[PDB]
Design a protein around this ligand. Structure first.
Ligand SMILES: [Zn+2]
Lengths: 34, 383, 48, 62, 90
């Protein structure tokens, strides 16, 4: 219930943070190459 | 009446014309700090260069590195004792150099920092190599953003400028040219180059500065020159918050008249970044596009030109206008997006290639502009 | 005074609405989250 | 035709400078790629640690 | 005599016709790393190439030995030195 939805939302924000980190790494690598 | 306000036309460049440009960058230029609380910041050259790398402009422009200027080359303007003290001084032994520092006007408003000689030599070498490549005719434009510090006198370093590489560049251009027109955009008056070339005809030290309560305290409409240099000192003092349209309407007539009468063979165009909105000390309200319209108009003639850097007490706006001007020099318009770089997080909260004007009291009444244009035309017809 | 103050923005609303419509954020600024959505939180943005 | 001894020696010196610059560029690029990688890994570590700490604190409060 | 420059040693070798390869520049010396061995200069200046170069220290030692070995006589050189001093303007 409340615990499950809290866990799901926290996992969603963690996944968004991880995707942001991956995007920053991709941009840094493109800057490396250029 | 001579001044006439006109709407700001969109940027247009000739596609048929091809221009060669030799950008100059010394990677070690942006590593010397004036102090903790000093407006001068050499980092802007490095950030601008990173921007030009990221925008893809390298595929249509030439870029090299200028060898540092030798001491004898650097002494083409300044006195022997001045350069000797500037080399011998260090932030750690000024106790034995107190009298020399007092005499040379250094330490209080312009302080001694390690690597000072390296920075001065880098700027001087950039200017001298740009002038030398201009003489050889290989490159039509010799961009040297590192230098442009035009506040250095013959024996004094006032206005945060220790060495005036513009004088050396003009000298090495004059070794093969009879008349070179010098254009200033820095808010402060170009006291150093003006004093150096105040008694000569072979140069046209045109300026666009602001008159008021400042450190230079020069740049009046009265000063026109001595000897053969009479009426050869064009000054256009202005006031607070001159906007883009009126700045263009002031610049274009005057430059057109100079090119029609003076007829120079090369142009030493200063491109100081302290004439923009949001500056630390500059009172103007010019936007980046207004800062680049002057350069585009100068370029449209089709003569060799040496673009230099100079002042600019902020970093992001100065870098943005410098990269925009470099792009415009290639007959290429740069998009508003600032592609990611190591110093991306600097560029404000807008993250767009634009500097936006602020609301300041536009003291520049049209009557003042008409009067100054009439005076300039009267003193210019004598050439 | 009210009339002139309102006219000074009505005369250029025609181009301001076009500038607002054509606005497009760069793809790689939202990651840094410096684009404060406080105006978007309160709907103060003029888009649309 | 480029057969001059002094010109050839100067060309060799310039090519040595070019090759050292190319080596230094590659070394610095690899180093700062490694720097970006370690920063990114540390960012992920801190994000996961804060996630788990927040979950534990929420469980403790509840 | 390693405190001197590359130009002096190269001109010394040219003048005395010594059979010693030109010294490697300091930057050229530092070029030779593991990855630095894949560059054109190092791959063309190490093995099987008559244009091989050697470090500055050994050439400096060779030039020092040849300079100390080369005896001098004042009568042959002092007038020549004076003539060269009074001739450099021409
Ligand atoms: Zn200035």
């Amino acid at each position: 219930p409340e615990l499950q939805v809290y866990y799901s939302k926290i996992a969603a924000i963690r996944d968004y943070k991880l995707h942001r980190a991956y995007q920053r790494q991709k941009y840094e690598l493109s800057c490396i190459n250029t | 009446m001579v001044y006439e306000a006109t709407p700001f036309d969109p940027i247009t460049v000739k596609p048929s014309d091809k221009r060669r440009v030799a950008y100059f960058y010394d990677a070690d230029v942006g590593n010397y700090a004036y102090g903790a609380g000093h407006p001068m910041k050499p980092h802007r050259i490095r950030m601008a260069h990173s921007l030009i790398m990221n925008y893809g402009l390298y595929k249509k422009m030439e870029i090299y590195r200028a060898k540092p200027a030798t001491k004898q080359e650097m002494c083409q303007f300044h006195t022997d004792e001045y350069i000797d003290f500037l080399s011998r001084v260090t932030p750690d032994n000024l106790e034995m150099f107190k009298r020399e520092s007092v005499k040379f006007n250094v330490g209080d408003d312009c302080p001694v920092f390690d690597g000072l000689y390296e920075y001065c030599s880098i700027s001087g070498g950039g200017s001298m190599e740009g002038a030398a490549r201009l003489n050889r005719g290989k490159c039509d434009v010799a961009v040297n953003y590192a230098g442009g510090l035009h506040h250095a006198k013959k024996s004094e370093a006032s206005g945060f400028c220790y060495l005036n590489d513009i004088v050396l560049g003009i000298i090495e251009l004059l070794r093969y040219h009879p008349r070179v027109l010098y254009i200033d955009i820095d808010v402060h008056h170009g006291d150093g180059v003006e004093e150096a070339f105040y008694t000569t005809d072979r140069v046209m030290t045109c300026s666009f500065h602001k008159y008021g309560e400042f450190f230079p305290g020069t740049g009046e409409l009265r000063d026109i020159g001595v000897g053969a240099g009479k009426n050869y000192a064009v000054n256009v003092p202005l006031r607070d918050g001159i906007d883009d349209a009126t700045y263009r309407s002031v610049f274009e007539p005057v430059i057109k008249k100079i090119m029609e009468w003076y007829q120079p063979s090369a142009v030493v165009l200063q491109c100081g970044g302290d004439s923009l909105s949001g500056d630390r000390l500059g009172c103007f309200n010019l936007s980046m596009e207004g800062h680049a319209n002057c350069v585009n108009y100068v370029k449209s003639f089709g003569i060799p030109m040496m673009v230099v850097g100079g002042g600019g007490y902020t970093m992001r706006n100065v870098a943005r206008t410098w990269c925009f001007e470099t792009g415009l020099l290639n007959n290429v318009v740069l998009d508003k997006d600032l592609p990611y770089n190591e110093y991306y997080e600097y560029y404000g909260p807008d993250y767009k290639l634009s500097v936006r004007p602020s609301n300041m009291f536009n003291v520049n009444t049209p009557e003042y502009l008409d009067k100054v244009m009439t005076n300039i035309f009267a003193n210019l017809e004598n050439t | 005074t009210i009339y002139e103050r309102l006219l000074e923005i009505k005369q250029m609303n025609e181009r301001v609405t076009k500038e607002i419509n054509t606005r497009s954020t760069v793809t790689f600024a939202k990651d840094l989250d410096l684009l404060s959505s406080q105006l978007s939180e309160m709907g103060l943005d003029f888009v649309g | 035709q480029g057969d001059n001894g002094q010109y050839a020696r100067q060309v060799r010196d310039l090519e040595e400078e070019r090759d050292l610059e190319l080596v230094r560029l590659r070394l610095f690029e690899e180093y700062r790629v490694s720097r970006s990688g370690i920063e990114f890994q540390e960012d992920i570590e801190k994000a996961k640690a804060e996630h788990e700490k927040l979950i534990k604190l929420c469980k403790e409060r509840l | 005599f390693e405190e001197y420059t590359d130009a002096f040693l190269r001109r010394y070798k040219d003048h005395f016709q010594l059979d010693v390869p030109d010294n490697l520049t300091l930057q050229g010396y530092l070029l030779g790393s593991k990855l630095g061995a894949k560059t054109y200069s190092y791959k063309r200046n190490t093995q099987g190439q008559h244009d091989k170069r050697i470090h500055k220290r050994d050439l400096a030692n060779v030039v020092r030995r040849h300079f100390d070995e080369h005896s001098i006589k004042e009568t042959d050189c002092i007038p020549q030195f004076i003539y060269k001093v009074k001739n450099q303007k021409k």
